[PDB]
Amino acid sequence: QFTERALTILTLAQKLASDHQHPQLQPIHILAAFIETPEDGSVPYLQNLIEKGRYDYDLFKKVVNRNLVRIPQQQPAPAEITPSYALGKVLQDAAKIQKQQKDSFIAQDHILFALFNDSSIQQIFKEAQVDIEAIKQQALELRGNTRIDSRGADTNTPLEYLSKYAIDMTEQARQGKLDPVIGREEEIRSTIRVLARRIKSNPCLIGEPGIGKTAIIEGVAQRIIDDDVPTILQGAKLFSLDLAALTAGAKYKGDFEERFKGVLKEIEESKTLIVLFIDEIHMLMGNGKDDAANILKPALSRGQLKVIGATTNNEYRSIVEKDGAFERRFQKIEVAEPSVRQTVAILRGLQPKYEIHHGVRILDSALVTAAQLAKRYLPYRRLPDSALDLVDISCAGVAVARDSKPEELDSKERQLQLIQVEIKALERDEDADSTTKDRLKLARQKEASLQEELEPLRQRYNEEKHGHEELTQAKKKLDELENKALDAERRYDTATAADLRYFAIPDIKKQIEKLEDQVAEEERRAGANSMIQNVVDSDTISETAARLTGIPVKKLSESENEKLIHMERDLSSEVVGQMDAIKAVSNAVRLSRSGLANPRQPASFLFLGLSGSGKTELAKKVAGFLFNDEDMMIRVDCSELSEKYAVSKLLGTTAGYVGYDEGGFLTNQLQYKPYSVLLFDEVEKAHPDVLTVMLQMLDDGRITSGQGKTIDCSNCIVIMTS
Amino acid sequence: QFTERALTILTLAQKLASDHQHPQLQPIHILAAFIETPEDGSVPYLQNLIEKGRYDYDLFKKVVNRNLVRIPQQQPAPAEITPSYALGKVLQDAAKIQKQQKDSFIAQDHILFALFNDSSIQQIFKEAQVDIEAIKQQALELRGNTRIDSRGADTNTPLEYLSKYAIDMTEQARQGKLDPVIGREEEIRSTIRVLARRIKSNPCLIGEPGIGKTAIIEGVAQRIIDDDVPTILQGAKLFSLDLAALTAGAKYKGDFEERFKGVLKEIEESKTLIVLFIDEIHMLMGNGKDDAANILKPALSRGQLKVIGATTNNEYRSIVEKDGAFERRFQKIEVAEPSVRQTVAILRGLQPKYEIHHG
Amino acid sequence: VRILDSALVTAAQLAKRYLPYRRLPDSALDLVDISCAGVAVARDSKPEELDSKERQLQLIQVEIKALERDEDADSTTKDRLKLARQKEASLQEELEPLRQRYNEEKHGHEELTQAKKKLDELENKALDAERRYDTATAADLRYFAIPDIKKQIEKLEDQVAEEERRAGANSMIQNVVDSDT
Ligand SMILES: Nc1ncnc2c1ncn2[C@@H]1O[C@H](COP(=O)(O)OP(=O)(O)OP(O)(O)=S)[C@@H](O)[C@H]1O
């Protein structure tokens, strides 16, 4: 037969009769001719009959095909369509042409097997459909043993070919539709080799999200897409995926497995090298496991079936929990996060490429510092984003501050309402040539000019904004000269390697020069940029960071080292007490900023002695130097230190016991409390095993939770005192 | 006095019948039988109101539409006017003449297809058979109350679904409706960024209810409709609906989805830039958690053209706990509630209006 | 990839003793990967010489055509393009043997692997029934098939075409030192 899904392309028969109905129409026509496409029909546009399908290239058969079934006899809504003589037309011809494809039921492209003697509008080779070679032959030529679960594309073999929702690689940034990147390239490449590395080849390690590890895969794909590849790796494709029409199936199972298992089969067949990394099921499965592949691919790894993993380590270890063949098939790649130092060039590179988002210009550097300075201040975040985060945020606040150009606007909010008000009241008053107030009518001189000379400011603040528009907006185009070219070299093009490099190089630098050179100067503010139409981080961050955090204003600056000196030398001024402590303390800060100090671990320091006293300001006043929320510090009681561990600070329940809020206490705090000190009862009385445990963790300024999550920001101090 | 859109795409096809030629002639009806497509609705397409004769959603066999172009005149464009001999303007009275249905007058199928057996001159052919049907394309054209008094393309000119089952969003302001309640502008004025920002632009402010859940967007829309954006709102507009298009209904299943097919393309029709939330969390969330606008939302993150605002908080965290699954790639927060006097002031401002309502 | 492999072997025990928690031989097997990993490392596209030297020769072939058109390039101007074409030719020529050196060796080495592999087919196809006390059905095709393939082997195995570049070959160890892997 044809299929269960035959509705669509099969629906157009009564649609062909749709002029008026029909006592029946005929298998000379149907919307399956057009199928879902308005030219040649899926198959005889592309799918089956595109190249080889004989007649009806685009409008060939379908253009005039409707002549047969148009209009009824008398049909208000009596009837629609029916094959009649065509009823048995494909009946055996639907199930005959299948042979053994590794398939299930009757085929519409199987019904496309033998076509028909004459049912159609066309002359090609016969009275049958299209011309020749299509359907069962074309499909068999063009494919095999694959249609759809119980059904498929309506009338016609089926336009459906690849796995429904794909997320491109090859052609993805083939257009540069994604970005250049730097990152872990070899570090990556290392993997990427090993992505081949045979027998067990995929990475099946990775640390933790957020940073472009995705974006890696692409930069991965890059040299891959650069198609300079290990031949064994040479070809490939992925779409590293999630989800589907999946919830689509109501209450059914593996709606994935539905497309998915066929997707396997999609991928199963040959298609040369095509890489099947999906993404997250690692995170998935678990409980309420869906076994997308998780049972099957492990076997269905089968012949050369290639999927290359991405995830969080503890999340990963969260399957070290599940374990199993999660051992096998599974391999080892870390991740990292770099130094801002490392980071900037990235930060550098495409921020302009980004910038165009805001169509502004960028400042240079301290940004990044200030960003890293910032990075210190919202550190839960990934490194790179942070920029991006601030960046656009900056750019935003900028764009707010700037792109919204709300300088004149607030003026022109007030000053267009300050233009015509005071006008009519300044002309008259009782004392004219007498002296009581002799400035009386001076108040109209620049008043008439208030919004009036804001028109020059409308001019200016647009003028050199178009002096800034010329600056940025010309580039963004002129950007795409060298931009597209680098992607336009795509064939090893000397048409690209000369022409648009010419069209670049003569044009670019000149027009590059022009724009800042078309920024002359300004007397009110710096240079012809009126809004200044650029970005000063410090500024840009200040509020930002504020509107991130809190009153910087000291943090309107960094010296801190002198502050080290002075706040210290002044800790008196805020303490007046045991001074030498301050030193060692501050020395520890010097240490804290030594870093020539052993990187390991924040300072130890004293037990002080007694309580309820400067100890407490002592206890407090610390970040009063530093981070100046001494709200901060965490606490413990030696009392709380039992003779077994529950202790919910850290650890607590980790494996299989009751609750995972257990032990997060500090962590999640520490997580979002990357800087503090702790408290314990004098730290003194603490339970001995704890004392180990505490010092156990207290020692080693690099650790990870008893729940298995990184400990020791180690920058952050504790010193507890007894 | 009305239409010139539905009619403009129905009886106004005389202007499309000749660029300059045949002031009164019907060599070209239905935009002169060259226009648009059979896509959403407009232009030469499958049919005018309802046409079952030829392939649906398609203008002309071989080339799409473009039929009877360049009639037998030179440039007699504004002689006076008339299609179909002298009945062209009267062709705007035939939408109810055969009247399978579209509406009384001013319809694409109304004006042009108003001729039963007549369009301009072929016999009468765009998409149709005889008359009294108004069904084949008509229903498929979302006609049958597809007519409305707001400027639009009736039965041909527009195609509106998500657009039809829908809420104003955008215009709710330019047509005055509610006023400003001043307030958290600066917040929105902050959040104003959150709109234009590259990623995570999705702005849920999960603070106060009522006015204060409401009044925000509103003023936003105000501070939108003022149209002072550097960029986007110029080319951007907005959407919020909860069971607010077609059916909250229980008919069978997938009502959400059912509503979503609009939601699906909903922006991709790419009119302006349409980005906005309808409010609610669980609605944001879905049935328990379900995909409704939800698990599919990433595609819409992939579709961009986002949504915005939230609720009162906690269930934020709740889902944010339940998952930030996108919300991790969401970005926003809010503040909660201001104080007395400045409020009293805005109330001092808000004073007259509903008082004035009472006067 | 051939390697002398001896020390490489001995690397195991070490490498073994280095992360031996993993299953010693098959972990040692892991090395065998890691080896070819380290080789595939060396490999990438190509083995490792030009894909490295792609840093120069090809980026000097970028010098060959990168600057091909800027404002003006004729005789005396700021445009430095052409001069790379004079030199890299001979260099980029050697790529071709260098290319071959693994490739044409791989070409040969293709069969090499294939050779007894297919014997391990064919002599299994000999062994097809040899274990039933079946004999000649095998020997039938197996006649000369041993002393032809193996002869080709014998022929081709002997084939070096090095200057004498490294050993008896062209690029097989590709230049790959175990120790360094
Ligand atoms: N040189 C670079 N140019 C552009 N992007 C870069 C560069 N180096 C790193 N990236 C990353 O590209 C990323 C794009 O978004 P990402 O989400 O981080 O990709 P991803 O983070 O791996 O996906 P997840 O879920 O975030 S892990 C940014 O987060 C950057 O960290």
Q: Whose CA is nearest to atom 28 of ligand 1?
A: A212
- Among A197, A329, A503, pick the best mutation site for testing chain C contact (most C Cβ within 10 A): A197
Interface test with A, best of C21, C23, C45 (most A CBs within 10 A): C45
User: Resolution limit in angstroms?
Assistant: 6.8
Q: Is A539 exposed, middle or buried (0-12, 13-18, 19+ CB in 10 A)?
A: middle
> Which are the contacts of B85, defined by CB distance < 8 A and separation ≥ 6?
B24, B26
Yes or no, beta carbons of B190 and A18 under 8 Å apart: no
**DSSP for residue A602:** P
Residue from B223, B243, B242, B218 nearest B233 by CA: B223
Probe ligand 1: pick from A211, A216, A344, A346, max atoms within 8 Å of CB? A211
Instruction: Give the three-state DSSP class for A704.
Output: strand
Give whole-number Cα distances, A370 to A297, A351, A543, B325, in Å: 47, 15, 12, 30
The pair phi, psi for residue C92, each rounded to 5°, is -60, -25
Q: What is the distance between the alpha carbons of residues A10 and A384, in angstroms, rounded to a whole number?
A: 53
Q: Is B187 on the interface with A (CB under 8 A)?
A: no
Report CA Rg, chain C: 24
Q: Is B329 left (phi over 0), alpha (psi -120 to 50) or beta?
A: alpha
Q: Which chain B residue is nearest to residue A410, measuring alpha carbons?
A: B228
Contact B53 A18 (CB under 8 A): yes
Q: Which token pair is B256?
A: 């959400």
Q: Does A164 touch chain C (CB under 8 A)?
A: no
Q: How far apart are CA C118 and CA C111, in angstroms?
A: 9
| CA A623 – CA A715 distance, rounded (Å) | 13
Contact: C40, A506; criterion CB under 8 Å: no
Instruction: Report yes or no: A186 at the C interface, CB cutoff 8 Å.
Output: no
End-to-end CA separation in angstroms for chain C: 13
Give the residue carrying structure tokens 């069209």. A503
- Which of C37, C45, C65 minimises the CB distance to A498? C65
CA-CA-CA-CA torsion for B33, B39, B42, B46, nearest 10 degrees?
40
| Cα B347 to averaged position of ligand 1 atoms, centre (Å) | 47
A704 bridge partner residues: A710
Sign of CA dihedral B274, B276, B278, B280: positive
Is A19 close to B228, i.e. CB distance below 8 A?
A: no
Chain A residues lying within 8 Å of B54, measured CB to CB: 19, 66, 70
Determine phi and psi for B248, rounding to 5 degrees: -65, -5
Quick check: do B and A touch, 3+ CB pairs under 8 A?
yes
Which one of C44, C68, C69 has the shortest CB-CB distance to A193?
C44
Q: Which residues make Cβ contacts (< 8 Å) with residue A570, sequence separation at least 6?
A: none
CA distance B109 to chain A (A): 16
- Say if C and A touch: at least 3 Cβ pairs within 8 Å: yes
Closest residue in A to C42 (Cα) is A193
Q: Beta partners for A703?
A: A711
Is A501 close to C43, i.e. CB distance below 8 A? no
Q: Which residues pair with B82 in a beta bridge?
A: B24
C83-118 per-residue burial string, b: 16 or more CB within 10 A, e: under 16: ebeeebeebbebbebbebbbbbbbebbeebeebeee
Residue (of A519, A381, A209) closest to A391 by Cα position? A381
**Was A609 annotated as part of a binding site?**
yes
Whether the CB of C156 is below 8 Å from some CB of chain A: the reply is no
Interface test with C, best of A195, A501, A513 (most C CBs within 10 A): A501
Residue from the list C29, C45, C70 with its beta carbon closest to the beta carbon of A506: C70
* Closest CA–CA distance from residue A652 to any residue of chain C (Å): 29
> Is the Cβ of C44 closer than 8 Å to some Cβ of chain A?
yes
Q: How far is CA A636 from CA A614, A683, A702, in A?
A: 20, 8, 21
Q: Does C43 touch chain A (CB under 8 A)?
A: yes
Contact B38 A38 (CB under 8 A): yes
Token digits of residue B240: 């919020």
Q: How many CA atoms lie within 13 A of B259 on its CB side?
A: 21
Binding site, annotated residues of B for ATP: 207-214
Nearest CA to ligand 1 atom 10: A212
A226–C contact, CB cutoff 8 A: no
Q: Which residues, in sequence order, are bridge partners of residue A127?
A: A118
Residue in chain B nearest A354 by alpha carbon: B198
Could you tell me the distance, in angstroms and rounded to a whole number, from the CA of residue A539 to the centre of ligand 1? 26
> Using the beta-carbon criterion (under 8 Å), do A34 and B193 form an inter-chain contact?
no
A-C contacts (CB, under 8 Å): 53
- Distance from the alpha carbon of residue A216 to the mean position of ligand 1, in angstroms: 7
A506 Cβ under 8 Å from any chain C Cβ: yes
Residue A411 token pair: 């003026």
Do the annotations mark residue A213 as ligand-binding?
A: yes
Q: Is A397 on the interface with B (CB under 8 A)?
A: yes
What is C132-170 written as a DSSP string? Answer: TS--HHHHHHHHHHHHHHHHHHHHHHT----SS-SSSSS
Cross-chain Cβ contact C68/A197 below 8 Å: no
Whose tokens are 């309502």? That residue is B357
Ramachandran angles phi, psi of C144, nearest 5°: 65, -20
Q: Which of B53, B62, B130 sits opposite A63 (nearest CB)?
A: B62
Which whole-number Å values give the CA distances from B119 to B13, B34, B92, B129, in the listed order?
10, 13, 12, 11
Contact C36 A193 (CB under 8 A): no
Residue A392 and residue B198: Cβ atoms within 8 Å? yes
Method used to obtain the model: cryo-EM
Q: Are A11 and A31 in contact (CB under 8 A)?
A: yes
- Smallest CA–CA distance, residue B316 to chain A, in Å, is 18
| Inter-residue long-range contacts of B211-218, CB under 8 Å, 24+ positions, other chains counted | B211/B181, B212/B183, B212/B337, B213/B279, B213/B311, B213/B312, B215/B178, B215/B181, B215/B183, B216/B183, B216/B184, B216/B187, B216/B188, B216/B309, B217/B276, B217/B308, B217/B309, B218/B172, B218/B173, B218/B178, B218/B180, B218/B181
Distance, CA of A281 to CA of B115 (rounded, Å): 60
Find the length of chain B: 359
In this structure, what DSSP letter does residue A554 have? G
Other C-beta atoms lying within 10 Å of the C-beta of residue B326: 15
Cα first-last separation, chain B: 35
Instruction: For tokens 């000097």, name the residue.
Output: C60
Both tokens assigned to B195? 């709109």
In degrees, rounded to 5, the angle at the alpha carbon of residue B299 between the alpha carbons of residues B203 and B271 is: 70
**Interior angle at CA C71, CA C70 and CA C77, nearest 5:** 90
Min Cα separation B196/chain A (Å):
7
Q: Is A664 marked as a binding-site residue? A: no
In whole angstroms, give the CA distance from residue A577 to residue B137: 90
Nearest C-alpha in A relative to C31: A197
- The number of CA neighbours under 13 Å toward the Cβ of A184 is 23
Question: Which of A19, A356, A389 has the most B C-beta neighbours within 10 Å, making it the best mutation to test the interface with B?
Answer: A19
Concatenate the DSSP letters of all residues of B32-70 into one string. GG--S-SSSS-SS-S-SS---SS-TT-SSSSSSS-TT-S
Instruction: Please tell me the residue having the least CA distance from ligand 1 atom 15.
Output: A212
Q: Which residue of A has its CA nearest to B188?
A: A400
Cα–Cα distances in angstroms (integers) from residue A381 to residues A374, A415, A674, B327, in the given order: 11, 43, 11, 15
Question: Nearest residue CA, atom 23 of ligand 1?
Answer: A214
